[PDB]
């Protein structure tokens, strides 16, 4: 159920079949232009999980705080790191990782062998503004926006970092610290 492939790939061996191009047109010029761009993008990132998150209300430098921690890590390790960081940007990176993995599964890749192979940001459209200063001077007041792109590939070169895991506090009927026998510590 993949989108059609209209040309040969650049891989050493071909894994799919090229299909004939459509012979019908869209009603309006605007629609035709938009759909041609969509067709071009569908020729890319085959056999890999990709995600493109648009118009995140953050800046490039704020996003790079989180992204620099997950590059070249296994998907399982990268996902955990994004959860523990108490930053507003970490929420958007976590959504992108989940969206990309769902994309990989639809293409038929094994989620247990995925590695974060490429991550980068891109500038969006800015909201300009002005703020007054003292003695009649004025300054800038700009709200920034950024795009995020994540690519997941199988059996790519990965870093050896691994995090230790511990259980949380035990609360409820599963806690049995009250059964401790303290009579032993009085002996020699």
């Amino acid at each position: 159920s993949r989108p059609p492939l209209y040309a040969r790939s650049g891989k050493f061996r071909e894994s799919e079949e090229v299909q004939p191009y459509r012979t019908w047109y869209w009603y309006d010029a605007e629609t035709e232009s938009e759909e041609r761009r969509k067709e071009l993008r569908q020729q890319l990132y085959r056999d890999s999980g990709m995600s493109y998150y648009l118009n995140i209300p953050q800046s490039m430098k704020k996003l790079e705080r989180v992204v620099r921690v997950i590059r070249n890590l296994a998907y399982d390790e990268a996902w955990k790191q994004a959860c523990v960081l108490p930053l507003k940007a970490a929420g958007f990176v976590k959504e992108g990782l989940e969206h990309a993995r769902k994309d990989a599964e639809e293409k038929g890749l094994d989620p247990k062998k995925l590695v974060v192979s490429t991550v980068y940001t891109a500038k969006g459209k800015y909201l300009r503004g002005f703020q007054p200063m003292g003695k009649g001077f004025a300054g800038r007041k700009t709200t920034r926006k950024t795009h995020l792109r994540i690519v997941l590939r199988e059996n790519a070169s990965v870093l050896p970092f691994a995090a230790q895991v511990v259980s949380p506090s035990r609360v409820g009927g599963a806690s049995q610290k009250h059964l401790r026998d303290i009579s032993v510590r009085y002996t020699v």
Binding site: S51, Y52, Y53, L54, N55, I56, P57, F92, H99
Partner: peptide, 24 residues
């Protein structure tokens, strides 16, 4: 806290448009 009633519709449209979303 004192937004105009004559531009309520346009504020709503801007709020919907300016939301993050995934491409295709």
């Amino acid at each position: 806290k004192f937004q105009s009633r004559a531009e309520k519709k346009y504020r709503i449209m801007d709020e919907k448009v300016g939301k993050p979303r995934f491409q295709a």
